[PDB]
Each structure stands twice: as C-alpha cells, then as structure tokens.
Design a protein around this ligand. Structure first.
Ligand SMILES: Cc1cn([C@H]2C[C@H](OP(=O)(O)O)[C@@H](COP(=O)(O)O)O2)c(=O)[nH]c1=O
Ligand SMILES: [Ca+2]
Length: 129
C-alpha cells in the first residue's frame, strides 16, 4: 500500500473526518474500526481523540487498501496517518474503537489492529473498562 497526501478540512467524529484529497473535499471513513457515535458512551472521547490527532498534525496522509475505495455513502475508505502515526490503530490502542467492519480484500492492517485491541483490552482501557 502507498501513502498519499491529504489536508484536513474538518474533524467530524471518532472514525470520520473531512479531508481534501486530490484537491476535492471528501468525507473519509476509517477502515477496520468502529468508534461509538457521539451520543454514545466514549463517543465524545473518541471524537476528541481523532480531532486532536488530525488538527495537530503537520502532515496528513491517506492510504487506500486493495479493494473498495468508497463506501455506499460516498465516503472514502482508508487508513489515515497523522505525522506518520496511523489514526485507525491509535484509536484501537486507546480503547476508543473496536476492530470492526473487516471485509476481505480491504484488510491489509487487520493483524496490526487486532494486536492493538488486545493490548487495550489487557490494560482495561476506556471501552474495555
Ligand atoms: C468501515 C466501513 C463501513 N462500511 C459501511 C457498512 C455500514 O453500513 P450501514 O450504514 O448499512 O450500517 C456503515 C457503518 O459506518 P458507520 O459506523 O460510520 O455508521 O458503513 C462499509 O461499507 N465499508 C467499510 O469499510
Ligand atoms: Ca461509528
């Protein structure tokens, strides 16, 4: 997989963000994860976590997997990086997202995400508390 440039337009919630990609505004949904909705427990903390990561980043990148690049709602499906650190994995590591929506052929980082989830669960963090 390859990292490509993008710039932040605006934070949305724990697992969606509006980015400019190839010069066009798009909503991105983060692959392999599910954060709580803002109305749910840990939703606001997940939103804040993603917001801080993407707003503080000097460089945002997106990486598409091998399969579908947009979902049925027109959202981009990607792994997002802030100053080289994967947002998707970082949310799971912090117990702010569950590994979820693992579809075959867009699952390159599944192992990495599951290992983060195991560690978060062992530490009893947030969702796992
Ligand atoms: C993350 C992801 C979500 N989706 C779709 C499945 C779910 O459909 P439904 O809306 O029919 O439940 C939805 C969940 O996204 P959200 O968690 O943002 O609600 O997005 C994909 O199709 N591919 C993906 O990789
Ligand atoms: Ca969600």
């Amino acid at each position: 997989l390859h990292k490509e440039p993008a710039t932040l337009i605006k934070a949305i919630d724990g697992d969606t963000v509006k980015l400019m990609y190839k010069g066009q505004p798009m909503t991105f949904r983060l692959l392999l994860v599910d954060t709580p909705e803002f109305n749910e427990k840990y939703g606001p903390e997940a939103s804040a976590f993603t917001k801080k990561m993407v707003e503080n980043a000097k460089k945002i990148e997106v990486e598409f997997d091998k399969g579908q690049r947009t979902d049925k709602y027109g959202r981009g499906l990607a792994y997002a990086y802030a100053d080289g650190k994967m947002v998707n994995e970082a949310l799971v590591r912090q117990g702010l997202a569950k590994v979820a929506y693992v579809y075959k052929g867009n699952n390159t980082h599944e192992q990495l995400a599951r290992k983060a989830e195991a560690q978060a669960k062992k530490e009893k963090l947030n969702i796992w508390s």
